[PDB]
Design an enzyme around this catalytic site. Structure first.
Site, PDB file in Angstrom:
ATOM      1  N   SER B   1      -4.143  20.127  36.608  1.00  0.00           N
ATOM      2  CA  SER B   1      -3.562  19.054  37.612  1.00  0.00           C
ATOM      3  C   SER B   1      -4.777  17.208  37.177  1.00  0.00           C
ATOM      4  O   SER B   1      -6.148  17.432  36.947  1.00  0.00           O
ATOM      5  CB  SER B   1      -4.172  19.909  39.014  1.00  0.00           C
ATOM      6  OG  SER B   1      -3.771  21.118  39.032  1.00  0.00           O
TER       7      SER B   1
HETATM    8  C1  LIG Z   1      -3.963  22.017  39.639  1.00  0.00           C
HETATM    9  O1  LIG Z   1      -4.907  21.997  38.855  1.00  0.00           O
HETATM   10  C2  LIG Z   1      -3.755  22.637  40.604  1.00  0.00           C
HETATM   11  C3  LIG Z   1      -3.934  22.773  41.789  1.00  0.00           C
HETATM   12  C4  LIG Z   1      -3.283  23.859  42.932  1.00  0.00           C
HETATM   13  C5  LIG Z   1      -3.595  23.133  44.905  1.00  0.00           C
HETATM   14  C6  LIG Z   1      -2.813  24.384  45.181  1.00  0.00           C
HETATM   15  C7  LIG Z   1      -3.147  24.068  46.091  1.00  0.00           C
HETATM   16  C8  LIG Z   1      -4.221  24.628  47.005  1.00  0.00           C
HETATM   17  C9  LIG Z   1      -4.095  26.386  46.591  1.00  0.00           C
HETATM   18  C10 LIG Z   1      -3.804  27.173  48.408  1.00  0.00           C
HETATM   19  C11 LIG Z   1      -4.359  28.000  48.237  1.00  0.00           C
HETATM   20  C12 LIG Z   1      -3.330  28.719  48.983  1.00  0.00           C
HETATM   21  C13 LIG Z   1      -4.382  30.406  48.576  1.00  0.00           C
HETATM   22  C14 LIG Z   1      -3.539  31.074  50.375  1.00  0.00           C
END
Ligand SMILES: *C(=O)CCCCCCCCCCCCC
Lengths: 163, 544
Positions: B1
Site C-alpha cells: 500500500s
Molecule cells: C496496504 O498495506 C493494505 C492496507 C489495507 C487496509 C485495510 C483496511 C483496514 C484494516 C481493517 C481491519 C478490520 C478487521 C476487522
C-alpha cells in the site's frame, strides 16, 4: 424492527445508504452488498465457520489458499462459541445494531434473489446469515496480522513421538 | 500500500490533500467494496470496506480523508517454551512444570461417497496461546516448542474503532478517537483535513514489553530475523501492564509513533522512521518501529515529494498512473554499461536491446525490457555484495544504488544473472507488450492491467501469477481515492480497480476494470448535488 433504508446507486454501482439509525443503516449496507457479492460473502462465511470440508471436501482450498480441512480446524478453533459470545458482549449498542441490520439486509436480498446478479443461486452453502457469522468474519480479519499467519503451523503442532 | 497526506505548506490550494492507494487482494475476504453511509445530522462518510463490515475502512467526510497501510510493527509474540525434561507435553515457567491444555475441535468432511465423516483434532495450548510448528525452524521436539500470543485476540474494539473514525471531524479529532480507543489491529493511519494538517499514526495494537526487559527477553537468533519472539520460561517476559493502555498487555498510545505536519507524510509499508525525512521518527521499541532500509516505493515517493514546489491533485494521481519502475533507477545505468561492455555477445543481444528500448515503465505499452528487467532483478536479489553503494544509514533515500562492476567476481556474477534471466525469457512464448501479458480475466475475456510488483518499485503495485499463457492479477492497487477540500465540499476522485461485484453476472463485474486498464479515474460523488447530477442515478427504499 426499525429496519428501513433508502439506497441510491451512482455510476458503477456505488451505493449511498441513508437511514435514521444504525439498524437501518446496516440493513441498507447488507442488502446492497448482497446484490453485488452474495456468493463471495457466503463462501467466506463458510470458511470462517470452518465448514469448507463439509461442503467441498478435503481436496479444495479457501480463498486464502489454505487446504479446506486445516482451514476448518483453524477457524473452528478461532471462532468457538465462547469467543463469539465474549466478543458480542463487548460490543456497543450502535455496533450491535449495525451488525443486526447488515445480517437482515443480506438475508432480505437472498429471500428475493432470482439469479440476476447471483451465480451461486441454489447452492446448499448459499444461506441466510446470522450476526455471529459477521463476528466470525471480523475475528478472521482481526488475526490476519497475528495467529492467522500461523494457521497451518497451529494445525501442524503435535508432540514428539518415540523418535 | 501507499499513502500520502499533503498539508497547507505544500498543497497548491493551501488546504489538505490525501492520496489513498492500498494494495490488497483482488478476490476473497479482503476484497474492498465502495459505499457511502449517512445518518442525516450525525454521520456522513464514504469510501471502501472489507467484506462483512458495516463501517467505512478507508474514506472521507466533509472535512477529513484518511487511509491505512500495513505497518511493520509486531502484533503478536512467539514464546519459546522450555519443555519439562521428563514430559514434552509440559513446559517450565520459573523452573515450575506446567501442563499444556488441550482443546479439541470436530470438523465434518464430505467424502468420496458424498457422505459426511467427523474428524477430531486436538489443539495444544499454553498460558501464552496455541503451539505452532514450522518444520525445520520452530519444531516441537523434546527440549523446546513455540507458542503464539496474538494481541488482537482480545481486541474487541475494532468495529467501534472504525465507526468512531467514520464520525471524526478533522485530523485532531481522528487522532483523539484512535488514541483513546486503540482498536486498530495492524495498520498505520494517514489523514489530511480541510485546514491543511497532514497526519501519520503508527497507532495499532502492539504487545508491550518495557525496554529494560527486551535484551534478556528476546530470542536473539529470531529477533535478528525480525520474528517477534520471547523467552517463555521466565514469567518476567510476560507482556508489560500499563494503566494508560486500552487493553491489558498492549503498548500505550503515548509510546507509538505519531507525526503531525503541514508539509507531507507518506508511507509505503516501511516503518515509521522516514514518514517525513525532515523529522525522522526514532527511539521506539523494536516491536514498534526500527530504522531499516526503505523499499523502492517509498524511495520513489520521497524522490517526488521532497523540494518546496506546490503539489496539485494531478501530481499525486500521476505518481500512480506513471507506472514508473523505480528499481530501474538503481541498476539500469550500470546494466546498460555491462551490455555495452559485452557487445556482440549472442546470448545477451536481445536482452540488451529490449532494456535500451524500454520506457522504464509498467505501462500497457511498455516493451519486453520490463520482463527482462524483472527476471534479472530476481537473480540480482540473490547476489552477495553486488551493490556499488550499499545501504548507508546517513543516506537512506539514495542507497542502495548501482552495480559494483569494478569488482571482477561481481561483474562475472552480474553478467551470468543477465544471461540466465534472458534465457528464461526467451524460453517462455512471447511474440508483445506488458499489457499483452498481464491481465485480469473477466468471464472468457482478458483485460490488460497496468502496473507491476511493488518489489520493483512500481507505485501502482500489481501482483500477478502465471496462469496458462498470461500473468493473472491477484492483488495490488484496489480502492483508489484522491481527496481535496474546495469550499463546495470534498472533491474525491478514484476507482475500484476490480469493480464493485465479484459476480460475473453483475453489470458491475468489469466496468471499473475497463477504466482501470485505461487509467481513467472518476468522480466519487459525495454531496446530494453530486449524486443528483449522475445520469445513472437509481434509488430503492426497503423495509421490514
Ligand atoms: C496496504 O498495506 C493494505 C492496507 C489495507 C487496509 C485495510 C483496511 C483496514 C484494516 C481493517 C481491519 C478490520 C478487521 C476487522
Amino acid at each position: 424492527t426499525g429496519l428501513a433504508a433508502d439506497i441510491r446507486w451512482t455510476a458503477y454501482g456505488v451505493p449511498h445508504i441513508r437511514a435514521k439509525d444504525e439498524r437501518g443503516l446496516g440493513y441498507g449496507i447488507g442488502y446492497a452488498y448482497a446484490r453485488d457479492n452474495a456468493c463471495l460473502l457466503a463462501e467466506e462465511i463458510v470458511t470462517a465457520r470452518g465448514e469448507r470440508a463439509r461442503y467441498f471436501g478435503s481436496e479444495g482450498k479457501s480463498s486464502a489458499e489454505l487446504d479446506n480441512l486445516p482451514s476448518d480446524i483453524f477457524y473452528a478453533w478461532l471462532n468457538q462459541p465462547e469467543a463469539l459470545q465474549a466478543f458480542w458482549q463487548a460490543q456497543t449498542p450502535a455496533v450491535r445494531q449495525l451488525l443486526e441490520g447488515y445480517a437482515a439486509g443480506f438475508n432480505r436480498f437472498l429471500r428475493e434473489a432470482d439469479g440476476k446478479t447471483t451465480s451461486c443461486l441454489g447452492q446448499p452453502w448459499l444461506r441466510a446469515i446470522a450476526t455471529d457469522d459477521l463476528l466470525r468474519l471480523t475475528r478472521r480479519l482481526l488475526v490476519e496480522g497475528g495467529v492467522g499467519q500461523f494457521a497451518d503451523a497451529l494445525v501442524a503442532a503435535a508432540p514428539p513421538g518415540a523418535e | 500500500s501507499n499513502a500520502i497526506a499533503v498539508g497547507s505548506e505544500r498543497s497548491a490550494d493551501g488546504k489538505g490533500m490525501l492520496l489513498a492507494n492500498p494494495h490488497f487482494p483482488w478476490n476473497g475476504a479482503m476484497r474492498f467494496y465502495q459505499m457511502h453511509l449517512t445518518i442525516p445530522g450525525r454521520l456522513d462518510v464514504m469510501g471502501a470496506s472489507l467484506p462483512g463490515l458495516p463501517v467505512v475502512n478507508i474514506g472521507f467526510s466533509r472535512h477529513l480523508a484518511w487511509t491505512h497501510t500495513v505497518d511493520t510493527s509486531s502484533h503478536f509474540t512467539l514464546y519459546r517454551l522450555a519443555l519439562d525434561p521428563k514430559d514434552p507435553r509440559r513446559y517450565l515457567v520459573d523452573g515450575r512444570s506446567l501442563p499444556l491444555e488441550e482443546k479439541s475441535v470436530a470438523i465434518e468432511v464430505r467424502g468420496a461417497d458424498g457422505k459426511l465423516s467427523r474428524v477430531e483434532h486436538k489443539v495444544y495450548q499454553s498460558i501464552y496461546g496455541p503451539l505452532v510448528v514450522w518444520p525445520g525452524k520452530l519444531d516441537w521436539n523434546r527440549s523446546e516448542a513455540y507458542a503464539l500470543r496474538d494481541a488482537n485476540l482480545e481486541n474487541t474494539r475494532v468495529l467501534q474503532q472504525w465507526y468512531s473514525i467514520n464520525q471524526a471531524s478533522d485530523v485532531a479529532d481522528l487522532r483523539r478517537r484512535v488514541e483513546a480507543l486503540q482498536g486498530i489491529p495492524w495498520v498505520n493511519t494517514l489523514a489530511a483535513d480541510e485546514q491543511g494538517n497532514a497526519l501519520y499514526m503508527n497507532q495499532s495494537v502492539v504487545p508491550y514489553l518495557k525496554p529494560e526487559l527486551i535484551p534478556a527477553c528476546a530470542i536473539p537468533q529470531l529477533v535478528a530475523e525480525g520474528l517477534p519472539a520471547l523467552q517463555g520460561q521466565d514469567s518476567r517476559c510476560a507482556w508489560s501492564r500499563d494503566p494508560a493502555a486500552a487493553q491489558a498487555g498492549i503498548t500505550p498510545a503515548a509510546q507509538l509513533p505519531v507525526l503531525l505536519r503541514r508539509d507531507f507524510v507518506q508511507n509505503s509499508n516501511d516503518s515509521a522512521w522516514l514518514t517525513n525525512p525532515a523529522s525522522p521518527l526514532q527511539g521506539f521499541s523494536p516491536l514498534v518501529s526500527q530504522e531499516k532500509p526503505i523499499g523502492p516505493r517509498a524511495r520513489y515517493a520521497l524522490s517526488r515529494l521532497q523540494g518546496k514546489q506546490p503539489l496539485e491533485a494531478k501530481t499525486l494521481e500521476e505518481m500512480v498512473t506513471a507506472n514508473h519502475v523505480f528499481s530501474a533507477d538503481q541498476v539500469l545505468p550500470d546494466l546498460l554499461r555491462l551490455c555495452r561492455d559485452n557487445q556482440g555477445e549472442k546470448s545477451l543481444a536481445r536482452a540488451c536491446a529490449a532494456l535500451a528500448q524500454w520506457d522504464r515503465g509498467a505501462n500497457l505499452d511498455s516493451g519486453s525490457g520490463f520482463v527482462y528487467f524483472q527476471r534479472f532483478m530476481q537473480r540480482f536479489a540473490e547476489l552477495d555484495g553486488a551493490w556499488k553503494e550499499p545501504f548507508d544509514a546517513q543516506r537512506p533515500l539514495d542507497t542502495p544504488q548501482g552495480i559494483a562492476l569494478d569488482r571482477p567476481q561481481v561483474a562475472t556474477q552480474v553478467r551470468q544473472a543477465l544471461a540466465d534471466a534472458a534465457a528464461e525469457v526467451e524460453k517462455s512464448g512471447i511474440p508483445a507488450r506488458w499489457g499483452d501479458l498481464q491481465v485480469s480475466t473477466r468471464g472468457q475475456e482478458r483485460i490488460a492491467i497496468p502496473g507491476g510488483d511493488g518489489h520493483f518499485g512500481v507505485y501502482n503495485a500489481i501482483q500477478s501469477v502465471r496462469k496458462g499463457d498470461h500473468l493473472e492479477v491477484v492483488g495490488g492497487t484496489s480502492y483508489i481515492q484522491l481527496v481535496t477540500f474546495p469550499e463546495e465540499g470534498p472533491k474525491a476522485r478514484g476507482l475500484l480497480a476490480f469493480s464493485q461485484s465479484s459476480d460475473p453476472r453483475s453489470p458491475h463485474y468489469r466496468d471499473q476494470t475497463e477504466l482501470f486498464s485505461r487509467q481513467q479515474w472518476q468522480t466519487l460523488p459525495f454531496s446530494d448535488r453530486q449524486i443528483d447530477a449522475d445520469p445513472q442515478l437509481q434509488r430503492l427504499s426497503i423495509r421490514e
